[PDB]
Design a protein around this ligand. Structure first.
Ligand SMILES: [Fe+3]
Ligand SMILES: [Fe+3]
Ligand SMILES: [Fe+3]
Ligand SMILES: [Fe+3]
Ligand SMILES: [Fe+3]
Ligand SMILES: [Fe+3]
Lengths: 298, 298, 298, 298, 298, 298
């Protein structure tokens, strides 16, 4: 069936690696592990050996997006579908696969410009994870890391590629007027991916989302940011579609982190809807001075 | 056993009756009914014919606090216990009982100065209640109206009277330094009553609490206040003891209304604890310019 | 603890015995058994050998009301309480107890004039009951036969006697204006007994209630009455207090039978309420030509 | 509260010890352990070190009936109640208590003539019990060994003593005509004790009952008896009161063993009833040639 | 009812404070907090501000045992019972109560020589606890800290005092031959206290027990001890009575810590039993060279 | 769909047949039945007439591995897939099928050299199984006998054959460094088959696994081995992948038996992972003197 099961892992690029190394543990409550051999910050959020890398770079960027598949055959088969649509599929070397803490992966570049990695056999270590501060941990498992929201030059081209080629299913859309956002799922998590287009020629990422196991973690996280002078860009609130109670934290790279609890789950009787608003309540924009997103190209 | 079961109803006194008449429906989402014959605003929150009165008066005040008991015998018996401790017990006339929409009640005055009414056979009308705006209604039943927090001159005198005479059970205490608050229960609701003492000679009320059936009602209520220029005195947050996700709204009388969701319930294996803080997160004081409480006497 | 557990059985008196013999089976769906030696119609509704008698008499009357108690000691002890209040307690002979299909009973007369029988060890025959027509049977067990509603000259005298002496607990009251009805319980069944007073000097019964296991039995029963020319005095509807979906059937004796489904159950967190109406919906009076109740004395 | 909790253990006396030693294991599926020092057969049915003794004797007899109580104080207190009613209470020696595999016991003789032992701290050995043949084990725990049915000269004298003194509660009665049987409970097991009176001057026991965990064990047990020439005195069937699917096996002592599955459990809403029959179905008397009961005295 | 609810907290005395400070966090997985003003190590295991103290001293000793009660009245009332039996009851000063992180406590000395503290209103801080290593935390709540096993000169004197005066209930006994151990409960936890007597004139403690939320924590804890050269005195195994899967760790004071998972819970249908063995399996004595217990007096 | 459902049965070859005959019953707790006509030991573990054979032979060997399929058509169809890949498929004679206590089977030889039997209609006898010692029996049903772990010359050749031809699904891998193990499933049991390669030219088996219904059976089994001088080669512990609490017992043939409780179950949302370790805790190698595996060829 060669389907993407979940988001497996994520690679960020930033000059502000030392600031992210602290941010991940002190604010988000991820577990620091040792750096890569090249000086990237590395984090865990569950039994996986590593789900997030922050690599040194000249600009802020999405280095790579890791997706989970059952095994080699499913990643190969999906690869073939992608290859037929244009992008070159490349099998990772054994030494490359191990750097990503996976049994293996095929990778390719989006028509848009983002690197995706079709992985399997993610390395796990049971009962060794502990958060960077006293919070109740994260909701992963079958729903994976969480989700990422990307900004694309051409919403139809991008939308068609993610659905028709990569095989994501439409969750719902927000059409308020300013923005039109497409939400995609590959499991019970309301979305593993979403896309918007601020305008032509623009590429970037708005946020990644982590789910915590308690609402008090979301509230505490906001208070931790107020205490340690980390920008909260969006007050605690609830989205119209995913129904998740969340805040947005501004990271040392301009990418934001949605810190959320209690998302509505995708069921077999799930019908996509259209919303004219982003939020039911809250999500007040607290820092509109800051850059609205993490822009890669203009 | 002559025990208080729940808080049945509440009587407020204010000059700002017309402002409260609107506030109750437009902000809190109570159902307006017709005024009393004397021009008091009257509200429902469930199947009870009336749980809140706002009577005209020269100053802001707690007119009366209605408590629920099984029947006449239980209210009489509790009455006798109270009478032995000092306060005069008076049986309401039939016409008085009907004004309160109850079968009957005995009333008395606290040593402190608050009027309490031991009632039974509250008038109810099934399947006729609808909120003042689209919210999911209130959690009452065996837990009653909610709770009230009073300010008293002498915390030991007050505490002893509520527990030893009126027969409330201690839930827990907050001792941060500024304040020491006692929480009392008579059912599964974390507290139906709480008391604090800002200083000697002072009497007043801080807030009443209403429980709603959804967290989105709490969030929406805040946004409604921002929209209609009603002061929110405390941001969405969670108390250390009751664990309820709530905001505080400043009413046309200086009394505040805690609008909350999902309180921890009192069980048979419940042990009282001491807390050094009021809130786990949130509950940021947004309007410290306003009067801190509803003061009756200095 | 000597408490009444449920209503065990019922004795009706009527000249129209042959009409009742048919009515019980053809309309209510009770099981006919053989007559007493004296020509009374006898019915079952569950595993009990006999719960209803219809004895020959000159007028319509309540012959006796059977109550259930754990054993001899509990009936004796309750007897002593009653005896102290005025009524003579008499132990039934063995041959009398057997006519009632019970191990034994003490009996007495109400101050009002009704005969009550404190019984125990009711005769049962498992897996031999089948209804008089294809309906889903009756809800009895711990809730017993059902309930009876009596009319009394003096509501306070009657009320005080049933609660303070016989040890019934108040369920709720209806005070519309025309009538004031008291509802009493001794188990999970909303009420086993209720009383009203049309005026001074009047004694009678309005109805007995049977609970069926399906709503379709209530609906079918109405249609059976329309088919066989039996008066339905009250259309399908729902009471404000007991919340039961029911119709009232006019019996060959002027006593009515409430045929109902899905009554709200008395819990340990049960507070009595006051209602200003009898019904939430339905219960339209279809035959106000007929006598309003079964009057015994004027 | 000094109540009997369950039947703990049982002592039988018979000349046919070797026949019982085999019978217990091969037919009933009890676990043989080593004999007492004096040559009694000893069996387990659960984690208890020993629940049944078969002692050598000249005639068939009930040697002793062990009852379970919480501790020494409860057995002493019940002892005092018994002592006041006539029977001498004797504390067992340490060496006697150990022979019974209990921490200690007080014993006394019934007015009727049966020895009862009020015990506590029964010796148990976890996870070492295995049946004498492949059956699904026995239902004990809070319901204990099972029950015994005794025959008494004077049913009122016996009944009064078991209920008013030993503190058993009436479960129900069977009054067919031939026999009148009283059933008593001290826990969820429908009965732990029952009594009947064939005539004056007669004392004996009819049967003991063991509960198995599967109906197939009851059926298999019958077929085992047919195979090994052990008399089945009553075919598989179901009692009117206890509702248990059971057969009766004739033991090497004339005492019968009811081998049963799926008894109706005593609840807090349990009302005693009267039955005119012993069985709903089955329980066909297969061997009326054999002695009807185990008679001790005439 | 003035009953002890649970074990609240514990005070150990040892010269080896620095070794315990590390041991508590690195081996047991408790959370270190700041020392007392006098240099005692302090630990949390749940939301309580502090449940364990390790005070400096010349010898190894049990400094004090904290018990939980509902409030002041219950501790006072139990106090009065104790006072009548001999020991002096002393109310703690406010400053003393705060050192113990409780609202208040009465204390007294056992006839044996152990200090017990009847406390209430334990200080708690929600959602701030994190273990000293990645384990799944501890099972406390209504079952409290866990349990302690003391060694006493005179088992009857001690037993009588704990049950008849302090109001503990007997759980069960182990009588193998070498030892006779009494187990006492005051809640669902199989035991909060147990006592044994190696011989006359001897007083001490064998172990305290902590319950963890996963079996893997017990297994990991053993492997942590093997890694860091901490003596495991008893291999993973299961007790006959409490059924808990546990190991024993030898602490820097000679007191052992039972590290256990999945204890059988005390129910309302709980009967005390007698066992002839301590363990079903495991609990192999790995270090019989070490002192068998923590002896205070000879 | 022609899929393998479970492992049905197993055939071992050893010179030490008499030692295995005892070992199976006394240590593992299997039920002995009569030998084959040729003197093989035969065992049951559930309602199946026979799941394990130990045949006489000159060396230690895996005689045959029985797999379960729905019927003849599914075994034939899978046969055809296998036949196409190289191995000859042979239908068993009726007399051969009966020796295996199955309705019929096709058999073939692995490219590696192991004999596999595709069977159906396994002979069962309900309610006749009892363990060789007092343990709580085995978990089989839809998960079958358990699993076997084989050693192969060429891991890719073997892996490809089991997955692509026999139609097993990958469960997970352990890659520590010394070994790389592949785990395969065909049902809810974490694995029914696993393979490793010590080096080129080597063929053998490490262990078979039996699941018991209680953890105490695993613990008791270890203690039984210590008592009866049977080598335990691996202490109680928990694997990283299957999460089963188990010990390894060294059998009279060099094959080991994993005796385990409480394996994690394969779900529809199951993603294969990679582990860098075999065990979370325990599984200490107690007898490294013994041969590491059962080697068939070098
Ligand atoms: Fe998002
Ligand atoms: Fe409040
Ligand atoms: Fe009615
Ligand atoms: Fe019986
Ligand atoms: Fe212990
Ligand atoms: Fe294995």
């Amino acid at each position: 069936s060669h389907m993407i099961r979940s988001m497996a892992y994520l690679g960020l690029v930033t000059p502000a690696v030392a600031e992210w190394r602290n941010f991940g543990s002190e604010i988000l409550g991820l577990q620091l592990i040792q750096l890569i051999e090249d000086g990237a910050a590395r984090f865990r959020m569950d039994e996986a050996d590593c789900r997030l890398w922050v690599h040194p770079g000249e600009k802020n960027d999405i280095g790579y997006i890791g997706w989970q598949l059952t095994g080699e055959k499913e990643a190969r088969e999906l690869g073939d579908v992608i290859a037929a649509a244009g992008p070159v599929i490349t099998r990772a070397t054994p030494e490359e696969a191990a750097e990503r803490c996976v049994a293996g992966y095929y990778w390719f570049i989006d028509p848009v410009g983002f690197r995706h990695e079709l992985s399997w056999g993610q390395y796990v270590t049971p009962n060794s994870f502990q958060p960077g501060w006293p919070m109740s941990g994260f909701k992963t498992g079958e729903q994976g890391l969480g989700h990422i929201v990307l900004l694309v030059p051409d919403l139809p081209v991008a939308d068609k590629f993610y659905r028709e080629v990569m095989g994501f299913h439409q969750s719902d859309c927000i059409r308020d007027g300013s923005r039109a956002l497409h939400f995609y799922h590959c499991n019970g998590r309301h979305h593993s991916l979403a896309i918007g287009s601020p305008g032509p020629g623009v590429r970037g990422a708005h946020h990644i989302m982590l789910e915590v196991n308690s609402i008090h973690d979301v509230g505490k996280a906001v208070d931790r940011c107020e205490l340690l002078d980390v920008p909260v860009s969006k007050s605690i609130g609830c989205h119209t579609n995913d129904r998740m109670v969340s805040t947005y934290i501004f990271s040392p790279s301009v990418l934001r982190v949605e810190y959320g609890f209690g998302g509505v789950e995708i069921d077999d009787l799930w019908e996509p809807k259209t919303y004219s608003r982003t939020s039911i309540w809250g999500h007040k924009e607290l820092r509109p001075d800051l850059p609205p997103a993490m822009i890669i190209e203009n």
